[PDB]
Amino acid sequence: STVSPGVLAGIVVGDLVLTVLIALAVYFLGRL
């Protein structure tokens, strides 16, 4: 087979951190 536990965690934590970065950037670009 499915996915290794390390690959999944990396993908997901990566997904979420990116989600946060985008959210911050939308907020601040919205301050302009």
- Which residue matches tokens 């970065």? 21
Contact call for residue 17 and its own copies (CB under 8 A)? no
Q: Which of 2, 12, 23, 25 binds ligand OLC (CB under 6 A)?
A: 12
- Contacts of residues 15-21 at CB distance under 8 Å and 24 or more positions apart, as own/partner, are none
Positions that interact with Ca ion (CB under 5 A)? 15
Please check if 15 is assigned to a binding site: yes
Name the residue number minimizing CB distance to Ca ion. Answer: 15
- Contacts of residues 4-9 at CB distance under 8 Å and 24 or more positions apart, as own/partner, are none
Shortest distance, position 6 Cβ to its own copies, whole Å: 10
